[PDB]
Amino acid sequence: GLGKDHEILRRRIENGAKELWFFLQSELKKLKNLEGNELQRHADEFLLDLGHHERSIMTDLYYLSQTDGAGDWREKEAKDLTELVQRRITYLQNPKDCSKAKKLVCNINKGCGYGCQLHHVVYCFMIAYGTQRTLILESQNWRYATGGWETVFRPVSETCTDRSGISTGHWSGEVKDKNVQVVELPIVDSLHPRPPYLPLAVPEDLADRLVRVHGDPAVWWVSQFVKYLIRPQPWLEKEIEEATKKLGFKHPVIGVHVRRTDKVGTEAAFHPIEEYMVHVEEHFQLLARRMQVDKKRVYLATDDPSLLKEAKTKYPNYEFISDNSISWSAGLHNRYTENSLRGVILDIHFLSQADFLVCTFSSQVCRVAYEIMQTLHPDASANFHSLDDIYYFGGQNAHNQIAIYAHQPRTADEIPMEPGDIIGVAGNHWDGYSKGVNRKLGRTGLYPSYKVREKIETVKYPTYPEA
């Protein structure tokens, strides 16, 4: 049986889109009869009117996802799936006889920062899960804390943290290492041979439930291992608890990560605070349609300690929540200390706890916070805006989309598409167009983002029925 509110909202979304289309044709015809001041004046009003109209449509779509008991079901199903995966990971990590268990050894000391190192451990963990090997994490001489993983986080196992085994060797494939008890896994950047237990694929035994519950099952699958990893030590839980109080961290709140310093060189670009705040302002307007928002709170995480004073001045109607001492210690000089390790764990924690995350996905810091966020809600796939890259996991397999609508290129920078063409996406320009390659042609260029759908990849993982 269909719900009454479900049908009212569906038809209102249809009529709102139709009316928006009536509005677009009428106003665009008027616009091309203008030039100079009048053209700029009316197009600005046109854009303002369109914004509210578009957000009313987005608000009805939000209500549609909650009506008819769908919100409670999606919450229950996401909770059941999380507990299913966590129990499997815990069973894998705690065999009865550690001296006889197949193992995978991971070294945390990758030459990069915390988020990059955390994603290395995640990649180790997912391959360990894929091969039914207990993850052994070797973290001594960790650049952030010489005492290792247990300085901040609980150990990845309770019964089996020892590397003992009758045979040991470097990774050389799941079939060749079939009878090697202890396999050491290197970093993903030069792994050969690559096993299938890599992003962005998900387990096929969970895929049907995931696509039904979650808008990007790839990130959800990655987040399950992030969730298991960052179980905090008791002293760290209390720091997080204390910081939440002293920071005045309450909802609604939008998280903003401004990555600079050594990233601006080659891995990303410099972005003014205005580029972040336009999306912060836009999302608070959306929230104000469904809830009361008296104070617009922004948790600002950044490695530029001069940004907080700048943001408070240029956006005085916002309440910025930030730890400027953490920002200062994030500088390349004082970056690899236990106090700085606490700082980045705290910054990522509050970013992940926000109701919306504005940042650059080229930074591993924001990707981690976006992954953790997936463990805090039934489906937080779209609660982000990245100023550059789409979501990715470094070392992932080819991220492919499928063309659903044909495209004939208007300029030379666009690529043709036929329905069914596999499209290897490179990025979303957030202007209606995405850049990628057509795997029937080899051509790279732009194409309308709405003319493709995400190709969900699946992999036959072990299901751990004993758990």
Ligand X SMILES: CC(=O)N[C@@H]1[C@@H](O)[C@H](O[C@@H]2O[C@H](CO)[C@@H](O[C@@H]3O[C@H](CO[C@H]4O[C@H](CO)[C@@H](O)[C@H](O)[C@@H]4O[C@@H]4O[C@H](CO)[C@@H](O)[C@H](O)[C@H]4NC(C)=O)[C@@H](O)[C@H](O[C@H]4O[C@H](CO)[C@@H](O)[C@H](O)[C@@H]4O[C@@H]4O[C@H](CO)[C@@H](O)[C@H](O)[C@H]4NC(C)=O)[C@@H]3O)[C@H](O)[C@H]2NC(C)=O)[C@@H](CO)O[C@H]1NC(=O)C[C@H](N)C(=O)O
* Binding residues for ligand GDP (CB under 6 A): 112-116, 257, 259, 263, 301-303, 326, 330, 335, 340, 343-344, 347, 363-365
Structure-block tokens of residue 165 = 């085994």
Structure-block tokens of residue 11 = 């038809």
In 3D, which of 114, 181, 11, 94 has the Cα closest to residue 366?
114
H or E, element range at 42: helix 37-66
Angle in degrees, CA 313, 273, 241, rounded to 5: 80
Beta 400-403 vs 422-428: how paired, if at all?
A: antiparallel
7 binds, among a copy of itself, ligand GDP, ligand X, none (CB under 5 to 8 A by kind): a copy of itself
**Secondary structure (DSSP) of 144-167:** TBTT-GGGTB--S-SS------S-
Name the H helices within 273-379. 273-287, 307-314, 324-329, 338-353, 364-373
CB of 320 to ligand X, least distance (A): 25
Are 415 and 441 in contact by the 8 Å Cβ rule? The answer is: yes
Question: By Cβ distance, which residue is nearest to ligand X?
Answer: 394
Structure-block tokens of residue 268 = 């990303």
Can you tell me whether residue 97 is helix, strand or coil? coil
Question: By Cβ distance, which residue is nearest to ligand GDP?
Answer: 113
Nearer to ligand X, 321 or 365 (CB): 365
Nearer to ligand X, 78 or 301 (CB): 301
CB of 416 to a copy of itself, least distance (A): 15
Nearer to ligand X, 312 or 440 (CB): 440
Radius of gyration of the CA atoms of the chain, in A: 24
398 binds, among ligand GDP, ligand X, a copy of itself, none (CB under 5 to 8 A by kind): ligand X
Nearer to ligand X, 253 or 369 (CB): 369
Are 245 and 256 in contact by the 8 Å Cβ rule? The answer is: no
* 150 near a copy of itself, judged by CB under 8 A: no
Nearer to ligand X, 99 or 141 (CB): 141
Distance CA 61, CA 49 (A): 19
Distance CA 337, CA 21 (A): 56
Contacts of 36 (CB under 8 A, 6+ apart): none
Are 445 and 409 in contact by the 8 Å Cβ rule? The answer is: yes
102 binds, among ligand X, a copy of itself, ligand GDP, none (CB under 5 to 8 A by kind): none
* 16 near a copy of itself, judged by CB under 8 A: yes
Binding site for ligand X (CB under 6 A): 110-113, 116, 119, 187-189, 266-268, 362, 364, 388-390, 392, 394-399, 425-429, 435
* 435 near a copy of itself, judged by CB under 8 A: no
Interface with a copy of itself (CB under 8 A), residue from 63, 66, 73, 254: 73
CB of 105 to a copy of itself, least distance (A): 39
382 binds, among a copy of itself, ligand X, ligand GDP, none (CB under 5 to 8 A by kind): a copy of itself
Ordered strands of the 400-403 beta sheet: 444-448, 433-438, 422-428, 400-403, 452-454
CB of 276 to ligand GDP, least distance (A): 12
Interface mask (CB under 8 A) for a copy of itself, residues 39-58, using x and -? xx--xxxxx-xxxxxx-xxx
Distance CA 344, CA 259 (A): 12
CB of 101 to ligand X, least distance (A): 27
In 3D, which of 276, 295, 454 has the Cα closest to residue 356?
276
Nearer to a copy of itself, 39 or 441 (CB): 39
347 binds, among a copy of itself, ligand GDP, ligand X, none (CB under 5 to 8 A by kind): ligand GDP
Interface mask (CB under 8 A) for a copy of itself, residues 362-391, using x and -? -------------------xx---------
**Secondary structure (DSSP) of 220-280:** HHHHHHHHHHT-B-HHHHHHHHHHHHHTT--SSEEEEEE--GGGTTTTS----HHHHHHHH
Stretch that binds a copy of itself, among 17-25, 223-231, 292-300, 387-395 (CB under 8 A): 17-25
303 binds, among ligand GDP, a copy of itself, ligand X, none (CB under 5 to 8 A by kind): ligand GDP
Would you tell me which residues interact with a copy of itself (CB under 8 A)?
Answer: 1-4, 7-8, 10-28, 31-32, 35-36, 39-40, 43-47, 49-54, 56-58, 61, 64-65, 70, 73-74, 77, 208, 211-213, 215, 381-382, 405, 410, 430-433, 448-451, 453
